[PDB]
Amino acid sequence: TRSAVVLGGGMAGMLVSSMLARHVGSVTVIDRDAFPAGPDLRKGVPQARHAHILWSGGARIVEELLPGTTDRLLGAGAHRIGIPDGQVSYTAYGWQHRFPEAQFMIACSRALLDWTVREETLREERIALVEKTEVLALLGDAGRVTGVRVRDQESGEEREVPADLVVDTTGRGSPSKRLLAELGLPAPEEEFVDSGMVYATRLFRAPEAAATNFPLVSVHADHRAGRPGCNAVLMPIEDGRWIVTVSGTRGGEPPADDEGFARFARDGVRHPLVGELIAKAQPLTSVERSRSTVNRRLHYDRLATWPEGLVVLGDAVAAFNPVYGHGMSAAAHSVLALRSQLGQRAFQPGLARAAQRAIAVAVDDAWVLATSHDIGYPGCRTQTRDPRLTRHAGERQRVTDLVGLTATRNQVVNRAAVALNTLSAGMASMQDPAVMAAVRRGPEVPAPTEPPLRPDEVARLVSGAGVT
Ligand SMILES: Cc1cc2nc3c(=O)[nH]c(=O)nc-3n(C[C@H](O)[C@H](O)[C@H](O)COP(=O)(O)OP(=O)(O)OC[C@H]3O[C@@H](n4cnc5c(N)ncnc54)[C@H](O)[C@@H]3O)c2cc1C
Ligand SMILES: [Cl-]
Numbered sequence: 001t002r003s004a005v006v007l008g009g010g011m012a013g014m015l016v017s018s019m020l021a022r023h024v025g026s027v028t029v030i031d032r033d034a035f036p037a038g039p040d041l042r043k044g045v046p047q048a049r050h051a052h053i054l055w056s057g058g059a060r061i062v063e064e065l066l067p068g069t070t071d072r073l074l075g076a077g078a079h080r081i082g083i084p085d086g087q088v089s090y091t092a093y094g095w096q097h098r099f100p101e102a103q104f105m106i107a108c109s110r111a112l113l114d115w116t117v118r119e120e121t122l123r124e125e126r127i128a129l130v131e132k133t134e135v136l137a138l139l140g141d142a143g144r145v146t147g148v149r150v151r152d153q154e155s156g157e158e159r160e161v162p163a164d165l166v167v168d169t170t171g172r173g174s175p176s177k178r179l180l181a182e183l184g185l186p187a188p189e190e191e192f193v194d195s196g197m198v199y200a201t202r203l204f205r206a207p208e209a210a211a212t213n214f215p216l217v218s219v220h221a222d223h224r225a226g227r228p229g230c231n232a233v234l235m236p237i238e239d240g241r242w243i244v245t246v247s248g249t250r251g252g253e254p255p256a257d258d259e260g261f262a263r264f265a266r267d268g269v270r271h272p273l274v275g276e277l278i279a280k281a282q283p284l285t286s287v288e289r290s291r292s293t294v295n296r297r298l299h300y301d302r303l304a305t306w307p308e309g310l311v312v313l314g315d316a317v318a319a320f321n322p323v324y325g326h327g328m329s330a331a332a333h334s335v336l337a338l339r340s341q342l343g344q345r346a347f348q349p350g351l352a353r354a355a356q357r358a359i360a361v362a363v364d365d366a367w368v369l370a371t372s373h374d375i376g377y378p379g380c381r382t383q384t385r386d387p388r389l390t391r392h393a394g395e396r397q398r399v400t401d402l403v404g405l406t407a408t409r410n411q412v413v414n415r416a417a418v419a420l421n422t423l424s425a426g427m428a429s430m431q432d433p434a435v436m437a438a439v440r441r442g443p444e445v446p447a448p449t450e451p452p453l454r455p456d457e458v459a460r461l462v463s464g465a466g467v468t
Pocket of ligand 2: 046047048289290291292
């Protein structure tokens with residue numbers, strides 16, 4: 001009984017459809033893109049060409065919604081990299097000491113990830129993906145949404161698709177503002193923080209012995225220094241490749257040519273490690289850039305009136321600067337928020353509004369971590385009324401620089417710090433007296449003077465071929 005319509009067949013649409021199918025009779029997923037039968041790139045998800053990190057916090061939610069997905073990923077070549085034992089990271093406060101594992105992440109191409117999530121989701125015969133279909137309008141009115149009017153791209157025919165619950169997961173380019181304007185709802189408050197960052201990514205084939213068990217490598221900007229923020233990240237993926245992404249805020253954007261890529265990875269960042277590693281490797285693709293960098297949030301939950309049977313989640317409600325890598329886990333967290341409201345209120349009046357409010361709390365931590373670090377860079381453009389970004393930005397940056405400094409050299413602080421950064425624990429968890437005590441205890445190890453690479457990792461950057 002009861003039917004749901006999901007707008008957009010990306011990561012959020014699939015996760016929300018897996019969940020919704022356990023509460024409703026039928027799920028229909030509408031997407032305007034065409035979907036490949038294998039793990040390939042598609043135009044509906046252009047971000048798939050850049051490095052994608054799946055933090056533990058989101059990974060554990062994906063596992064719960066789609067049991068077995070983690071292993072199908074690992075079974076297909078994805079790497080499980082422990083944090084911080086498997087990262088070589090030059091943070092704004094110096095090198096992170098590689099303490100034993102506290103959290104983890106899954107390292108794979110986004111194309112493989114999306115395909116593995118879709119395939120596992122669509123095993124449920126009651127979910128149906130409707131490809132190459134444009135979303136024209138929401139059916140019903142400002143009081144209650146009753147489905148969506150769509151158009152088939154091939155035939156051009158328009159038809160209405162009924163629904164007791166419509167979920168918009170059309171991503172960052174969501175037409176939800178248009179859709180609800182045609183419904184007759186007021187425009188929602190839009191908050192954004194635009195550092196003006198730009199991405200540049202190339203694929204590489206790793207040295208043969210380094211195809212497995214290689215660490216995640218990152219060089220971070222110093223947000224405290226009044227200079228454009230430049231970063232560089234090297235991540236293993238399936239089939240013995242490395243995806244390498246370099247980024248830079250307004251005034252420090254990486255170039256588009258292959259030659260300038262290696263120099264930026266060498267000279268454009270605060271340490272040339274990533275530039276040194278990619279020179280052990282062979283390029284496979286040319287430079288791909290992207291400007292989809294703005295942290296933008298739509299406060300749908302604060303509207304004066306909200307229709308029953310309508311929910312917005314994923315990038316359509318809150319998108320982030322990708323250098324922190326929270327987007328997918330934020331979408332996962334908001335699917336569990338919808339699920340929790342479904343079990344509490346079923347489909348009674350108030351479900352859509354209660355879900356929209358709960359989704360706003362679900363994404364808040366990822367929204368704060370990104371905006372409070374982007375707001376400092378020179379030339380940053382902002383539109384916000386949030387006091388945490390306007391009034392208490394200086395004091396919140398003072399506590400955060402001391403947790404970050406100590407976490408590089410204190411095991412307890414790091415543990416609690418990476419639990420928050422991977423969205424495996426809430427913001428309040430940093431207020432545990434046991435955490436602030438360790439912060440006051442100070443460093444237990446010296447600050448590393450060189451990149452903390454293992455000899456056996458560096459050893460596998462060469463083959464030894466020309467040696468009798
Ligand atoms: C460069 C970059 C790097 C990133 N790195 C990370 C990372 O390391 N870790 C992480 O967790 N997140 C990362 N993200 C964020 C991540 O890509 C998104 O958070 C995630 O894709 C959210 O999924 P979604 O379903 O909301 O949107 P999408 O994944 O984009 O899915 C949207 C879907 O809706 C469809 N659609 C769009 N518009 C319409 C329309 N008008 N009508 C019908 N269908 C439509 C699209 O075809 C697509 O199928 C990164 C993003 C970028 C841009
Ligand atoms: Cl992109």
